[PDB]
Design an enzyme around this catalytic site. Structure first.
Site, PDB file in Angstrom:
ATOM      1  N   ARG A  24       0.818  -1.212   0.000  1.00 24.21           N
ATOM      2  CA  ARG A  24       0.000   0.000   0.000  1.00 24.21           C
ATOM      3  C   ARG A  24       0.845   1.252   0.000  1.00 24.21           C
ATOM      4  NH1 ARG A  24      -4.417  -1.870   4.632  1.00 24.21           N
ATOM      5  NH2 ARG A  24      -5.350  -3.558   3.383  1.00 24.21           N
ATOM      6  N   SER A 118      -8.211  -1.854   0.969  1.00 22.26           N
ATOM      7  CA  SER A 118      -9.174  -2.152   2.019  1.00 22.26           C
ATOM      8  C   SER A 118      -9.976  -0.906   2.381  1.00 22.26           C
ATOM      9  CB  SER A 118      -8.442  -2.761   3.232  1.00 22.26           C
ATOM     10  OG  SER A 118      -9.244  -2.847   4.400  1.00 22.26           O
ATOM     11  N   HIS A 119     -10.003  -0.580   3.663  1.00 22.90           N
ATOM     12  CA  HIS A 119     -10.749   0.581   4.107  1.00 22.90           C
ATOM     13  C   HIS A 119     -10.035   1.915   3.845  1.00 22.90           C
ATOM     14  CE1 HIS A 119      -8.116   1.269   7.562  1.00 22.90           C
ATOM     15  NE2 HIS A 119      -7.995  -0.045   7.583  1.00 22.90           N
ATOM     16  N   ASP A 289     -16.771  -2.605   4.712  1.00 21.36           N
ATOM     17  CA  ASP A 289     -15.626  -1.788   4.317  1.00 21.36           C
ATOM     18  C   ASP A 289     -15.405  -1.830   2.801  1.00 21.36           C
ATOM     19  OD1 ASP A 289     -14.508  -4.371   3.985  1.00 21.36           O
ATOM     20  OD2 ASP A 289     -12.650  -3.837   5.031  1.00 21.36           O
ATOM     21  N   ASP A 291     -13.416  -3.156   0.581  1.00 20.21           N
ATOM     22  CA  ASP A 291     -13.229  -4.361  -0.244  1.00 20.21           C
ATOM     23  C   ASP A 291     -14.146  -5.517   0.181  1.00 20.21           C
ATOM     24  OD1 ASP A 291     -11.638  -4.630   2.121  1.00 20.21           O
ATOM     25  OD2 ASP A 291     -10.514  -6.265   1.177  1.00 20.21           O
ATOM     26  N   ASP A 293     -14.676  -7.281   3.183  1.00 18.15           N
ATOM     27  CA  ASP A 293     -14.419  -8.399   4.088  1.00 18.15           C
ATOM     28  C   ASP A 293     -14.664  -8.037   5.557  1.00 18.15           C
ATOM     29  OD1 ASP A 293     -12.221  -6.771   4.346  1.00 18.15           O
ATOM     30  OD2 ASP A 293     -10.717  -8.385   4.373  1.00 18.15           O
ATOM     31  N   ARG A 294     -15.108  -6.805   5.821  1.00 19.61           N
ATOM     32  CA  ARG A 294     -15.508  -6.381   7.182  1.00 19.61           C
ATOM     33  C   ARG A 294     -16.966  -5.966   7.208  1.00 19.61           C
ATOM     34  NH1 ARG A 294     -11.015  -6.712  10.257  1.00 19.61           N
ATOM     35  NH2 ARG A 294      -9.083  -6.458   9.043  1.00 19.61           N
ATOM     36  N   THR A 358      -3.539 -12.142  16.367  1.00 18.17           N
ATOM     37  CA  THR A 358      -4.015 -11.274  15.298  1.00 18.17           C
ATOM     38  C   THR A 358      -3.452 -11.695  13.949  1.00 18.17           C
ATOM     39  OG1 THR A 358      -3.879  -9.464  16.922  1.00 18.17           O
ATOM     40  CG2 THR A 358      -4.271  -8.865  14.607  1.00 18.17           C
ATOM     41  N   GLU A 377     -13.333 -11.575  14.537  1.00 16.85           N
ATOM     42  CA  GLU A 377     -12.371 -10.605  15.089  1.00 16.85           C
ATOM     43  C   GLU A 377     -13.153  -9.411  15.591  1.00 16.85           C
ATOM     44  OE1 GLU A 377     -10.217  -9.527  11.533  1.00 16.85           O
ATOM     45  OE2 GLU A 377      -8.773 -11.170  11.736  1.00 16.85           O
ATOM     46  N   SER A 379     -12.472  -6.460  15.368  1.00 17.66           N
ATOM     47  CA  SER A 379     -12.400  -5.367  14.398  1.00 17.66           C
ATOM     48  C   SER A 379     -13.321  -5.615  13.192  1.00 17.66           C
ATOM     49  CB  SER A 379     -10.949  -5.163  13.946  1.00 17.66           C
ATOM     50  OG  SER A 379     -10.396  -6.382  13.476  1.00 17.66           O
ATOM     51  N   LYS A 390     -12.137 -13.095   5.073  1.00 17.77           N
ATOM     52  CA  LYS A 390     -13.371 -12.770   5.785  1.00 17.77           C
ATOM     53  C   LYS A 390     -14.408 -12.246   4.771  1.00 17.77           C
ATOM     54  CE  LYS A 390     -11.142  -9.994   8.341  1.00 17.77           C
ATOM     55  NZ  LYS A 390      -9.811 -10.282   7.716  1.00 17.77           N
TER      56      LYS A 390
HETATM   57 CA   LIG Z   1     -11.264  -5.064   4.100  1.00 17.18          CA
END
Ligand SMILES: [Ca+2]
Length: 559
Positions: A24, A118-119, A289, A291, A293-294, A358, A377, A379, A390
């Site tokens: 990233r 991601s986020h 989020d 992508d 997965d949350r 984690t 998780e 989070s 996830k």
């Molecule tokens: Ca994500």
């Protein structure tokens, strides 16, 4: 579509580490640094043995953020030149992280390259990420990301087809004939949603869900994709197929800048959804989020289901879901800092509970051993072994399945759960960008204090209740699958009443302080969480001397 292969001289960069979730950097770094993306893509592909490239397929797609399509074109041009036989690419470049995992496993691809950070914010002034997943559909492990890093540091050239251009917008097979190469390069553009939806159609009872979500007496839902990748998944699955009214799909058009906001599903980043839920009109809300997965889960009036409770509730009602009725439950897991709510369910139903450091790899290992059905998780992460990432929309359909069988509100399901298992009040304090020296000193001093022979047995008074130390250590985990030993994974203060305090440094420093307060009393389980947590918070701050070491009188964020 008749194209030449050329060799481009390049100069290596020294900071292209693939991490556990990808490389990233700011978008501007990718744009202003000559061959930055090209070098990294070449390094990934050079991990594939030449002899195995022609029969290989790579899955490629991302979360829709600015620069994604340009990166995808580059991946095609370089993959083609390097003898990779096929790419499978989501339409418009779009694939959620769970969809990538799904497709890799379905078509037995060698892996995938996911264009997501991601986020993290996207746009011309935002972030960009390049994530590599391997043949089990999950994140490339450290031995692979190590090799990619090493290659990138000394790379002096890459192979590319400069004139190759993929039409990302139209479905089907595009073939590219390469000059002086016998075999063609093939790109298949697939519908972004189809394979993932077909997977979910087998996991869940879509007939029951259609009945739940359709008509006058429907469950009323608001599902917020935060202008990120899950948008079309929500529209095509929940609205089009399962019949939820179109208004159910909130912020479900992917935007290159995620609407100028951070696509992270919590109460403040998803403040608009929370305010919508407050009006008492809707029964269920969720956010994802960037992508996919949350996930965050909300009930009527914006009732907040803690992620640590969410996984416990899914576990306690898991045979509401056809997939688990068929596989059975192979095991449960949570990360160590996640609350002990899942444990209560696992103990009572006599299913193994794995407490992992984690990180994804610990869950993935257990799944590959047929030992893990459901993981969580704190989070905002929930998953199952249906894939190896996830899956936020999956968690939502799991919740909808439970609501359909239970025929109760979200809040009543939680109230019943707390009454049955006791409640694990839970919060996470983040202290962001603290001075590293002070944070390190705090952790080293606390650990030394905990290691003293007399620390176990020590009593801490509330107010009224006395907390007694049962065990105190720096968490270590021996992986039952790959044999690795993970050390220094977090300072744990474990109390005889089922409560815990956990300190971690994030991997300026970030201190994460997790508070898990267990209560069984009917007169306590429906009190306000930050009030019920105050005694252990007080104990944590005093024993750690956090204010004294860091200068902080308050956390940056409370979740
Ligand atoms: Ca994500």
């Amino acid at each position: 579509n008749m194209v030449k292969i050329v060799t481009v001289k390049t100069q290596a960069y020294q900071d292209q580490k693939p991490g556990t979730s990808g490389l990233r950097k700011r978008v501007k770094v990718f744009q202003s640094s000559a061959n930055y993306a090209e070098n990294f893509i070449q390094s990934i592909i050079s991990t594939v043995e030449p002899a195995q490239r022609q029969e290989a397929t790579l899955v490629v797609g991302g979360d829709g953020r600015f620069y994604m399509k340009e990166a995808i074109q580059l991946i095609a041009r370089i993959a083609a030149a390097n003898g990779i036989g096929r790419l499978v690419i989501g339409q418009n470049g779009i694939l959620s992280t769970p969809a990538v995992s799904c497709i890799i496993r379905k078509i037995k691809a060698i892996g995938g390259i996911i264009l997501t950070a991601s986020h993290n914010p996207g746009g011309p002034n935002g972030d960009f990420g390049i994530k590599f997943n391997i043949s089990n559909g999950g994140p490339a492990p450290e031995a692979i990301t190590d090799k990619i890093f090493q290659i990138s540091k000394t790379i002096e050239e890459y192979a590319v087809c400069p004139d190759l251009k993929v039409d990302l917008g139209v479905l089907g097979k595009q073939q590219f004939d390469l000059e002086n190469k016998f075999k063609p390069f093939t790109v298949e553009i697939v519908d972004s949603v189809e394979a993932y939806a077909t997977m979910l159609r087998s996991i869940f009872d879509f007939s029951a869900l259609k009945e739940l979500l359709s008509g006058p007496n429907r469950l009323k839902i608001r599902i917020d994709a935060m202008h990120g990748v899950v948008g079309p998944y929500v529209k095509k699955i929940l609205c089009e197929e399962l019949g939820a009214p179109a208004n159910s799909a909130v912020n479900c058009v992917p935007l290159e800048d995620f609407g100028g906001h951070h696509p992270y599903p919590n109460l403040t980043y998803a403040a608009d959804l929370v305010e919508t839920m407050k009006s008492g009109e809707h029964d269920f809300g969720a956010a994802f989020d960037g992508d996919g997965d949350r996930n965050m889960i909300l009930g009527k009036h914006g009732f907040f289901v803690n992620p640590s409770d969410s996984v416990a509730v899914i576990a306690a009602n898991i045979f509401s879901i056809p997939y688990f009725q068929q596989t059975g439950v192979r095991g449960f897991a949570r990360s160590m800092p996640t609350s002990g709510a899942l444990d209560r369910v696992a103990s009572a139903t006599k299913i193994a509970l794995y407490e992992t450091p984690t990180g994804w790899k610990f869950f993935g290992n257990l799944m590959d051993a047929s030992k893990l059905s459901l993981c969580g998780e704190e989070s905002f992460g929930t998953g199952s072994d249906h894939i190896r990432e996830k899956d936020g929309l999956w968690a939502v359909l799991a919740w909808l399945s439970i609501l359909a069988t239970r025929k109760q509100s979200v809040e009543d399901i939680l109230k019943d759960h707390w009454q049955k298992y006791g409640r694990n009040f839970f919060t996470r304090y983040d202290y962001e960008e603290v001075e590293a020296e002070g944070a390190n000193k705090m952790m080293k001093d606390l650990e030394a204090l905990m290691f003293d022979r007399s620390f176990v047995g020590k009593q801490f008074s509330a107010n009224d209740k006395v907390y007694t130390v049962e065990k105190a250590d720096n968490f270590e985990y021996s992986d039952p699958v790959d044999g690795s030993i993970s050390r220094n994974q977090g300072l744990r203060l474990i109390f005889t009443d089922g409560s815990r305090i956990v300190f971690r440094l994030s991997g300026g420093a970030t201190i994460r302080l997790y508070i898990d307060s267990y209560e069984k009393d009917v007169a306590k389980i429906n009190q306000d969480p930050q009030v019920m947590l105050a005694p252990l918070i007080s104990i944590a701050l005093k024993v750690s001397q956090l204010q004294e070491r860091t200068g902080r009188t308050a956390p940056t964020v409370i979740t």
